[PDB]
Symmetry: D3
């Protein structure tokens, strides 16, 4: 929570940011959202890969044909404006584009407009306060990720998350920190809300998007970072059991950043701590906010 | 719009039924809903298969482990109460149970509670003012229905409607009234928001739930009415091309009631009009609200 | 061979029934056909389930939207005319609707018409001289039947037969009389060019159309004969290994009639000879052309 | 049309190139063919990747075990002879190997030979007059490409085209220029009769053959031209929604050459016009027949 | 454990029943086995559905072409002989047919013989001492059952059990009594070593064998018993979530007999105790050994 | 047969290496094994990729959670010790870890231990005395390889060989030397007990592990040797028909080493003999044991 929320171009106090219970999205999962982090850095408060996230917000909307009135630059300014208007230097930002109060049929009435919200607020490590340093214990879920050509997994939409709820809630109920879902083919897809990476013999592996995995922006950053670090990367389908044979394993996400996975289904991964390659990647990722890692791609948007 | 809406145990005026923009369901499709019709009949206003719908509402929630505080009878009284107060004699009732303002993680905090809304309002034939009489032109969608064990299609959840949007809007954009979706195996599943029935040589056919089709209450009713009429019924998987060979075809649902399908993909069905068996079923169905069809099951819940 | 072939309404000498090499179907498999048998019965030469076959010819053409100018009755009269013109009392008839000389694009030009042929000629036991009496040895093919929603297996089309060729030729190359193909799910579909039945504990079994099996007219007749004989019938998916556990197994088809399968993949079926249930259906079937079996369905169309 | 057609070695007047209506391929889709273009270049009339096409003709026939008596060199010489005999300097050539008048069983009799035809004639832009310059509007089909191990999609066979007909005619019926088919896994396969390419972030993408896509010779040429142009190429599975996120999309084929796709399912691709990368490949491709692009692969076969 | 084990026709003392470590089955899973119970009854010690089990032993062997020298009657006598020779009146019998010391290639040398063992010994309720009366808590496994046409699930072979080990061990590790596996389609298959039954609205449901479920003999007994009890039975595919909506649920097996399942994945089934319909079936099953249930099928083989 | 066998830490004479008939693995396929060859080389007897195999042996056990007491080096010394004692200079070593006499439930009792055996003995070319030189005739099986997430194909377990038996014995019964299996998707997986390689236009191809193929150690070696030879290698999914178009094809394995495949399904590959690239690879492979090929990886473990 924070003091204000950007709501359709106007800064509204948090408590007054409300919508009608008959809003389309509450009944039909009709919304697309983003996860963005603003970090403290040597350059001051910076939003990580800001433009890439707003571009994806638009892409998700385009896929479902949800009309978006704000341009990417407007959404970005709006985002920076809510970060300052709330006096935050570090935070998690949640943009949300949803079909609002427009009538009950699943097909929105012609000419409708979508509602847009953007809330920023501090948010701890997604998988725990000990996650980033100690790693977590994962569980392969009994629920599979959405099949191709059903609900586009390339789009980050609200409705998709019933699946992430089933996969993630199951792991927790069974005492694990996160759940790893397989696609309808029996191959590794990703975690409930984070992409999956494996390390074997010094090479980094990760499932392609066609494994029903969302095109993670953190995932993309890690691949390019790894290439810079001289680490070979292979985007390929991964068997379920490969999780038990990898030297290292970890998850990526805007919220979960880079979280080592010390075990899967009770089976220890490597030494049971953060692996050497994971450490290198992790250090290179954060060194970006210390300036130790050169921002060669222009991934740090300054809030001002 | 109506005048009041049942919101968490109390009837609030329509304009005040609002929830926070950070309500879980707006971001994660975490809601389950129902569709119910109140018919003005020879016995005055009656809710059709009222209890069955509230039970299903409970089952959907149970599947996702969404905590529900109200019992079926409680919900039933609330529904009935909503119709009276708004002074409706015929209407569409939309009960809705969703995870509200509980924080931003997809996994809700332990001990949370859901918000429950029940709105009622008049709503015309779902597929057109001519639909029920002249029948509609349907299109087979290029989008498939959710695969087994990904999202439970036996549950009527809000999140899953992203799929119905893709299926239904496509047919509509191409000039049809509704889209028919195949499951991931290539067999007929159902319409975007209606179950699919076919008639050939006097026998009634419809896919089983395992064809990724919702276990519709209108569908179950039709199967029963058909049997009472001596019409043989076969619940079995159906081929996509079977839509072109069927003597008759129609859709079913609370909103769409019993809508004949006069053409599929531009291929006329039968004589391009409502078929004889669809006719009997339909007359039998609507005969319930005139007394011509004896309510031998107890499907009419008097509003009072 | 025979003397005349009905061609677009005309009785053409067999040697003059030719088409340009640039005819569409020779390049794109764009044709639909039927197999029909005229038997020399107690009622004289009669065409078996004549209307049913011509109706299917139309259905197959309809699925592909091939324009057909002859009505089912026109087709039937032409068929009888062909038989008499060649003075045949028993024969195999091959009606064939195909896209002809209309230009090289796969999509035919608007307003085009199809060419129609009906050739009648004597044709013996499809699966061999001993087949009907002693049964054949079948092999499960390494090639699978077409998947649902690719090339509609419910339509009897020319292009379909590339599959039948692969399945059948393989079995024959390995020394068997016919090949049994499995669908893409690994379940029994049917023989390369005939439906497959199994007999277990006095109950008759056969796969539904959704197992990528063509809705055989002979298959349909068997099912009806079986029920008149007091034999329970079950149309359900069948496992590949069920072929090794069945008491009896046989194939059906217009050309193949009812052929007993004494062995599958070298494993013996029952006594390795025609089974008792098979025997009954067979006698019942052929008894239709001697009068021993009453034509309660009106399956014998008098040629005259 | 043209004056002569090479037929089993002889130069036959177009009007005399006929086959019996009882020819095997007219009933069983038993034929394999090729699309080849002769261009009027700076070197005179040349057949593009002539040997490659005839080799594929043989491969396709080999897969089905169709006996072929002409060698690749005999076929090529016949093709050049056909072109010259019709005094053509630019044309589309259609070689066709088919099972002819050999009896009605699907399995041809032992010792049979195939009939071979090579017809040459002028043929314009496969996808329209503006297609090459302005791009077309594509639609994702509701029909899927043949599954692996059913009908080998690597073989260019006549029977295959029933699928291409369904896919293409649907798009055309809905007002689009071409249809894009997905495989049975829900991933992009290709266009009804052309391979599909995507351009994203300056990188060229196209599905592998295992996505049920025919190994296009034009596709292969593009990949080679791309690498000479310094364009990175990635043959990988592509999601259906990737079509909406790609910077550019285009189709390839002998008939279709290189046709830009400006929109998919009504959604605009990039600027809605030919993309920059597409532009380069296109110029590079056509520059082969003007000399601007060096034939480093020996793709221009002199007709003489 | 007991005093003697029937080993290739000779009663050997338990401890001396050994085989060479190079026995085929230890390296290739090449064995087929059965589970049979002998009960105390009013008729004295009786083996339940004795002939049916030995017939299946033979069927399993036939499927893998393992030569079996003993006839069914010999195996039965041998079985009764080990029950008496060990002085048991109630017990679990384990027949085992395995490829022995014949060399290391997976394909056994031509002319080989299989080894056969039959051990009887008391064995408590498979799923616990409180299982049959209180019911158990089940868990849907993250491991799926074998796909059709890979390893025939209709055959009860040793090699198959690696799967039952993965499914069952997982449920236990997570604190459950048994695991329920879904097939590769996402539908209910069965428990790790027991068939699955569901009860909804007084009707009994169970997956067909094509759901990759073994043709349980206990399962078969229950179906016939239910029919006798007037209970409608439907053999059909069941969705994963149906487990959460059934009134009752239970497992069947020779070892587990009839075990109520009070919960699945933490979700209570019905009232959480043995359900009414399950009780009826259970009582009817055991009444067979008290003589209260008439043995109308001849399921009780007397040991003597 | 040899003279001694390493059995649980001590070398016992061949005739005494026996386990109880009630050993878990005999009834449940619960064992994991390896295949290793000892070559007499320019450096005397050397075990090929000794450590890699013992590691894999450990990984397979870890996948099934089979407790292993010995370390890799321990196992390695035991292997080496087995070769010396038996006085072999070249041989096939079969390590075997299995669940022994621990009770009759599929789930072993907590705290159990596995039995470990390591046998060595001379073994000729796996597919014939002419195999490696003349190549073999292969057949595509009608049985498919285990699907992902059913049985982990990344583990070399005994139970899974029921599948290799079905695949391999079929080809053998039809007169071929080995069978090639497709996965459940219809793509090439591998041979019954060998990985499958294809050569086309100088490039080496082989399916990835995700094609249900074991991650062979000979396969990995070949990929490395090929690269050292400048041969491009592509690990990708391969179509079934690609077997007929490849210039060269061969199998790989510890037992089969590098066996050329001269024909598939009766269709000759290349010139019907070992192909040029297979030749180079092979010469490179066997060159390791003469010193001609520099062991640049450390694949030869001296027996001493
Ligand atoms: C948001 C999300 C991720 C992480 O992607 P980032 O762009 O790196 O935040 C991963 N998986 C799913 C399903 C997601 O919704
Ligand atoms: C609500 C719904 C139906 C219709 O079910 P009824 O219970 O008859 O209203 C059909 N299909 C889907 C996908 C639905 O959501
Ligand atoms: C024609 C055909 C049959 C047989 O059907 P009938 O109507 O009985 O002749 C069976 N299978 C296939 C694939 C066929 O084409
Ligand atoms: C012929 C064909 C193509 C195009 O291949 P080219 O060799 O480039 O002509 C593409 N797809 C299909 C289905 C085809 O038959
Ligand atoms: C043995 C077994 C059963 C139970 O079958 P019964 O004949 O009733 O003993 C169920 N599932 C599997 C996988 C089995 O092996
Ligand atoms: C053992 C085996 C191989 C060969 O692997 P290598 O490590 O090279 O010996 C190939 N396929 C299967 C199924 C195997 O079991
Ligand atoms: O990582 C993110 O930014 C979004 C996923 C986390 C969640 O909202 O559950
Ligand atoms: O709101 C919709 O679009 C679906 C309504 C479904 C029903 O209640 O029948
Ligand atoms: O022509 C064939 O090869 C099969 C025809 C099938 C039939 O007519 O029954
Ligand atoms: O004939 C067609 O319709 C397509 C031919 C494809 C080609 O030759 O490129
Ligand atoms: O029920 C049976 O008879 C066999 C399965 C139990 C087991 O051996 O694990
Ligand atoms: O024993 C077999 O039949 C397989 C041997 C596999 C290998 O070690 O290469």
């Amino acid at each position: 929570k924070a003091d204000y929320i950007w709501f359709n171009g106007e800064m509204v106090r948090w408590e007054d940011a409300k919508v009608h219970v008959m809003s389309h999205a509450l009944h039909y999962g009709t919304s697309v959202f983003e996860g963005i982090r603003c970090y403290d850095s040597h350059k001051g408060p910076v939003v990580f890969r800001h433009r890439e996230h707003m571009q994806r917000l638009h892409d998700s909307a385009k896929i479902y044909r949800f009309p978006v009135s704000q341009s990417i630059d407007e959404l970005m300014e709006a985002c920076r404006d809510v970060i300052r208007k709330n006096n935050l230097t570090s935070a998690y930002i949640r943009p949300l584009i949803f079909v609002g109060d427009v009538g009950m049929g699943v097909n929105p009435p012609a000419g409708y407009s979508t509602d847009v919200i953007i809330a920023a607020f501090p948010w701890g490590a997604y998988l725990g306060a000990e996650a980033l340093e100690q790693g977590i214990d994962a569980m392969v879920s009994s629920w599979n990720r959405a099949a191709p050509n059903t609900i586009p997994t390339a789009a980050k939409a609200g409705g998709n998350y019933l699946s992430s709820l089933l996969v993630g809630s199951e792991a927790r109920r069974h005492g694990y920190q996160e759940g790893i879902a397989l696609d309808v083919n029996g191959y590794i897809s990703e975690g409930a809300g984070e992409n999956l990476f494996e390390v074997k013999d010094g090479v980094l592996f990760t499932p392609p998007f066609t494994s029903s995995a969302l095109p993670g922006i953190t995932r993309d950053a890690i691949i390019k970072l790894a290439k810079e670090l001289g680490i070979e990367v292979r985007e390929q389908v991964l068997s379920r059991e490969s999780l038990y044979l990898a030297d290292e394993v970890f998850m990526s996400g805007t919220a979960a950043e880079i979280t080592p996975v010390r075990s899967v289904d009770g089976i220890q991964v490597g030494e049971g701590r953060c692996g050497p390659v994971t450490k290198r990647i992790q250090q290179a990722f954060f060194g970006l906010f210390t300036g130790e890692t050169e921002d060669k791609w222009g991934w740090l948007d300054q809030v001002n």
